C-alpha cells in the first residue's frame, strides 16, 4: 500500500540589521565537593584554621608540639567487623597539619595522591605504584601505612 507524504511550509522574515561585536575572554572553572570521596579532603589550603581542617577531615588521632606544632591525622578503621569483603577503599592515610599557635596551618603534609598519583608534597618526591590493579583510590590506599 502506497503511503502518502504530507508537507506544508510558510514564508519567513529577514532582518539584515545586526550588531557586529564579538568579545573574547578567559575563565577556567575547576573544583569538586565529593565529600563521600577520600580525594575531597584536598579541599583544605595553607592558612586554613585548625577548626576548619578538623571540621573538614576530623580531629587528629596523633598530636605533638615542636616549635612548629603539628597534628597527625591517621584515618583509622573500626573494630573487627564481619571479615567477608576485604574493603579496598578503607582509610589508613597519614595527614599532618603543621600550624602556628594562632591555630592556623602554615604547612600541610600529606600521604596520598596530588591531582593524579601518590605524591609527597612536603617531600617534593613522587613514589610510584603499578596502576594495573589499584586504579582510582587503591593507589593511595596501597602505601597507606603509618611508619
Amino acid at each position: 500500500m502506497a503511503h502518502h507524504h504530507h508537507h506544508h511550509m510558510g514564508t519567513l522574515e529577514a532582518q539584515t540589521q545586526g550588531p557586529g561585536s564579538m568579545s573574547s575572554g578567559s575563565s577556567q572553572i575547576y573544583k569538586e565537593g565529593y565529600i563521600l570521596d577520600k580525594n575531597a579532603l584536598d579541599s583544605i589550603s595553607i592558612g586554613s584554621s585548625q577548626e576548619q581542617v578538623i571540621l573538614a577531615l576530623g580531629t587528629p588521632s596523633l598530636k605533638t608540639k615542636y616549635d612548629n606544632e603539628v597534628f597527625y591525622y591517621i584515618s583509622q578503621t573500626r573494630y573487627r567487623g564481619m571479615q567477608f569483603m576485604k574493603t579496598k577503599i578503607i582509610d589508613r592515610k597519614v595527614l599532618a597539619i603543621y600550624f602556628n599557635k594562632n591555630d592556623q596551618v602554615t604547612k600541610i603534609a600529606n600521604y596520598g595522591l596530588q591531582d593524579g598519583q601518590v605524591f609527597d608534597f612536603i617531600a617534593q618526591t613522587t613514589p610510584t605504584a603499578t596502576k594495573e590493579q589499584p586504579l582510582l583510590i587503591q593507589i593511595i590506599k596501597g602505601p597507606a601505612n603509618l611508619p
Side-chain angles (χ1 to χ4, degrees):
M1 181 180 181
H3 296 201
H4 301 119
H5 47 263
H6 54 252
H7 55 266
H8 74 122
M9 292 296 178
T11 188
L12 48 71
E13 293 296 295
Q15 288 175 330
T16 50
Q17 304 178 331
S21 304
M22 293 296 298
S23 43
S24 56
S26 48
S27 179
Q28 295 68 28
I29 308 82
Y30 186 69
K31 50 72 181 179
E32 68 159 283
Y34 299 82
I35 304 180
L36 290 305
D37 285 89
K38 289 71 188 304
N39 44 271
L41 293 308
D42 182 90
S43 186
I44 58 176
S45 300
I46 302 179
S48 190
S49 181
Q50 170 185 148
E51 299 184 76
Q52 299 289 29
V53 298
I54 62 85
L55 181 61
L57 285 63
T59 43
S61 304
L62 298 178
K63 298 179 293 296
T64 183
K65 178 189 295 300
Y66 79 93
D67 304 277
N68 191 147
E69 181 168 40
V70 56
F71 293 158
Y72 281 80
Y73 304 123
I74 174 181
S75 52
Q76 278 290 90
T77 185
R78 292 293 66 201
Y79 66 108
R80 62 184 197 254
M82 176 57 180
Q83 302 300 329
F84 182 82
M85 60 297 172
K86 186 173 180 295
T87 46
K88 60 282 291 294
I89 194 178
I90 48 178
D91 297 277
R92 287 183 55 82
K93 314 176 306 306
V94 183
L95 297 306
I97 291 299
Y98 299 77
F99 68 103
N100 55 37
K101 189 179 181 182
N102 193 86
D103 297 286
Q104 291 184 270
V105 67
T106 176
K107 196 63 76 299
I108 303 179
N110 61 330
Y111 206 177
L113 58 69
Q114 190 64 90
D115 297 88
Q117 62 183 30
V118 58
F119 177 76
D120 291 77
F121 197 78
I122 67 293
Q124 302 132 146
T125 191
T126 314
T128 45
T130 180
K131 49 76 73 293
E132 183 67 75
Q133 182 64 29
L135 283 304
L136 182 59
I137 210 67
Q138 304 95 274
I139 276 178
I140 73 178
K141 215 293 293 78
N145 278 325
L146 68 167

